Each structure stands twice: as C-alpha cells, then as structure tokens.
C-alpha cells in the first residue's frame, strides 16, 4: 500500500533529520561547545561530530545507516565526516517535498544519477592540478597543506612531524600501498621533544633480565608463544601435608620437568627467547632463568598481540606455540642489540634487522613531559593520513564555499537547459547543494543571506572568486588566505552521499 | 663454583615454596549484598559470631551507627561484620522500621533490635553500644553497670530516704 511506506519513510526521515541537527552546529573551525552527560555521573566538552555520533545511538536502522556512512567517510578520506551528513540531510529534506509532489522513486533515482554525473564533471573541471613526482613537488605540496592545516604554532616550532614522518615513511615508495601497520609507532616518557629519530628496524621497550652482560649479535632470538610454568597439581594440597613424605617425591619430578624442557629448546641456537603475556601461565619459573644464565641468556617477556603480528611481519620468523614443533621457521638474521636510556628515560632497544629487506620503519617520541607523549602523539597519525591520501589524487581545490555555490549555479543552468520531467529534480538538487557557506557565516557570526547572494553573484561573474575568510570575517580569495584541500575528499563525499540517498529512497 | 651455584636451587626452590602453607584470621568490615545471606546460617563457620545491619538513606541516625561498628571491629578481630541495603530483603517492612542487627551464632537470631526508641536516639556512644552487647567476647571493659543512671523523678525517692535513715 501507500500508508505503511509513507509512514515508515516519514519516520526514517524524522530520525535522520534529528540525528543530523544534533551535531549540525559544529562544522568548521568555529564549532561551538557542547556538553553531553552519559547518565553515569560524567560530563564531557568537545566539538567534533565523529566521536559524539559514535558514543550514542538510537535502536533504529536509519541511525545505523548514517553511523556507517560517517565511519566509511572517515576511513576513506579522514576528514569532512560532519559535512557528509549535512549534505545527506539536505537531500532528505528536499526529497520529502519532492515525493510530496508525487514522483516515482525510479525517476528521482535516475535524475539524481544524471545530476551526479554532471556535478562530478563540473568539480573535476573546476579544480586545478599539481605535481607529485619528486621530493620537491611533494615537499611544497606538504608545505601548502601545513599552512592550510590547523594552526601550526607548535608544529612550525617543534616539528616532530614536518620531516620525521614524511621522510621516514617515504621508503615503501610504491603508489597506494602504505598500510598503517607499516608505521607502528612507539612512545616513551622522559627526555625532550627536541629529537624523534629513525631506525630501519623494530624497537622494543621493556625490562630484559639481570645477569652479567647482554650485548651481542647472532641469529635471531626466536619467537615463542610458549608457557614454562608446570601445570598446577590436581589438588590444592597433596595427599598428606607434612615434611616426611611429599618432599622426597615431588622434588625430582619438578627438577626434571623444569630442566628437560630448556634442555630440549637448547637444541636450536642463540640461547635467547621472547614470550607472550602471562594471563593464564601462573607462577613463572626462576630456576629456568638461573639455568639460562649458565646458557648465555638474553630475553624479553610479555609481548603483545598487535606486536606479535607486526614483528612476525618485520623479521620473517613464523611463530611457535609449543616445544614439539621446532623444525624450521624459527630464526632470522640480526645485527646488534642493547640500546640504553640515553640522555633520558623510557628504556628501549634498537634491533636493526636487515633480514627481510621488505620496507618497514618506526617512530619514537621521547620528551621532558608526559604531556609531550600527549601533545606530539597522533598528530603524525593524522598528517600521515593526509600525506597518504595525496599519493593518488595529485589535485587540490580551494575552500571557502566557492565550489558549493559554483556547482549550484552550474546545476541550476543544467536544470534550465534539460527541460523535462527531470529538470525540477535536478533543480532541487542544485538548491539543496548550497547550504554550507551560510552555516560558516553563522559559525563566524554574520547575516548569511546577503553574503551568500553576493558570493553567488561574484561566481556568476567569474566562476572562480573569493571564498570565506575566517580571519577577518570578510570575502577574500583563498589564493592569499591559503586554505586548500585535495579533490577526493569532496568527490568521494558527493558520490557516496548520492549513492546512499538513492539506496535509502529506493527501499520501501 | 657450579655446586654452590647450582645447589642454591634447593636453597631457593622448596624454600619460597616452604612458605606456601597459609592460614588466616579476620579484620575490618566487608560490604555484602544479599547474594550470600541465604546459606549464611551454614556459611557461619565454627563459633564465628557475626553481626548484621540494615540500611536506609536520609536518616540522621542511620549514618551514625554505621561508623561505630567499623570502629569496634578494629578492637575485636575474631568477630566479623556486614553492611546491607533493605531493598535486597522484604520490600515494605524496612521503610517504616529502623536498623535491626540480627546477630547469628551460626543459628537462630538472638537479639533483634527494631525501631529507633530502643537505641536511645543519637545519645549513643561506644559505651551504650558495647554493654548492650554483653554476649560476644567476655571483656566489656569490666563495667558493672552504666545506664547513664536514667535521670530521676524527684517525688519517689523522698519517702525512701526517710524510712531507711530513720528506721
């Protein structure tokens, strides 16, 4: 029928509208302060839409579609996760009255497809290209990014990311293959922000042992996800709790069990080993450590799953679960060890293993303040995603809302010239396109109507004019107030927004 | 060297392991909801005098008594204690009543002190909450009696002094 589909469509429309306007007013550098309470006695102050949308949700599928759309846009480009939902909400608000006019979903879908094919072309023709081949092209593009980035009052001074990151993951130079797992990063407290440095090998940080001397080189340690604490006896006490009986018996059993194993493992070389965590293995042995002391011990314990996959990728040593499998796939080259707490804190070691020449790097961050671990961290993550997305687009566009109203004008002209049934639909699409610059003027605080009208007039004059300057609240070209972005962060956003609105409109 | 080196094994193993036989007594007070009360007449152990409570929120007196217990526990270690919330037990009784500690000597309740009046009404101090116990432990600070000497009525004692001093 029509009653049930219209009702479910209107309910989903209201849900999407509500979840949209919930975080609508936090887009741009002037997002306002908002406080939400979990209801477990805790309040938070933040101005970012992604985490706020992620923390809470209503048990309704319409919300789940927007959540997955936001997370897909986040993993895809890494920015503009709050404008995509705004465009989706505008398209929904338009198609409400569009279906009120009485249009079949097929017509609306194909008309939106044509309008998208037109607007993508308009956008690719509007943007200007840049070069990405050599070090100079990428370096000047990075300078343009960082001056168009968030205010760099600390990065321009400290720069634990301006050179360290971009240079130290330029090695696996093959295009569009740079995993995050390729750049595992360590941190540590103590020292100074002055230096964050480079080794082509993995770097581990935890206490090793206490023995005579441990700084040598040989074939790899040999990774074990082992357990070497005897199984706890099948009782809490023994048959008889006294001095005479049990000491005569179990002494030899244990001195054999905890010696024959290390005896066997001694068959392969390097006399050194690395172990996983100890959540199940209880009462770690010590006599074993004493024995390995006679047998040239140098060992690290309590290694982690994420690291247990990353190391097995770096150094090419297949794991081993238990003693009865030690044939091969348990070794690798190695060159040195024993890095110290040099001029600071956070003990770490510098195994520089060139066994697998497969590119790999790491990043280290010390500092005279734990707040260095807090302020320098994850900025490399972000700027690194920024240098990751540019490897394939090599094009960029200016901000300020100019492309929005430009596309709106071009699509209005298109609707005018494609006279027919689809003209009203593509026209409504053009109208819904231009919503952002008004919101930006509101975030800065002005009368948006006159400003957007003047800017639409100026883009009717030259089609490439000033944008929105947040510095003085005026209308100056982006070519002097450099706030630019790649083209994919917009192209992907528009195409996925059209895709999701079409898919949700087709379903009953 | 190796002998002395190795043979510290038995000096170390079975030595740290010599200390693996343990046993305990009790101290302080542990927060406990209703999930253990049911079998508690059988969970009592042997001779372990236990004490109870019952909680409400908003009563000036009910907060007080909850401090005196945890203090006393530091004095007497063998006994143990419990702090409980009345929502867990019978639903509409606890609202009109006041805290009633049902002492359990691994058996039937022995002293059930309901309602405010019987306590005294915030004239309580350690003394008025210890001699009223008189049943766990056998010390009681060797006080013969201490009722505050409930302040008297002036008429009755008049005829008494006449017939006893001039008899």
Numbering used by the authors:
A (entry chain D): 26 to 533
B (entry chain Q): 66 to 232
What are the paper's exact sentences on this?
ATP-dependent chaperonin TRiC/CCT partners with cochaperones prefoldin (PFD) and phosducin-like proteins (PhLPs) to facilitate folding of essential eukaryotic proteins. The ring-shaped chaperonin TCP-1 ring complex (TRiC, also called CCT) is a ~1 MDa hetero-oligomeric complex that has a double-chamber architecture, with each octameric ring formed by subunits CCT1-81–3. TRiC-mediated protein folding depends on an ATP-driven conformational cycle, which regulates the opening and closing of a built-in lid over the central chamber of each ring.
However, we could not detect any density attributable to the NTD. We, therefore, performed focused 3D classification on each CCT subunit. While the NTD is mostly negatively charged, H3 has a unique positively charged patch (residue 75–78), which displays a high degree of complementary to the negatively charged apical domains of CCT3 and CCT4 (Fig. 2a(i, ii), b). In the open state, the PhLP2A NTD adopts an H3 extended conformation to apical domains either CCT3 or 4.
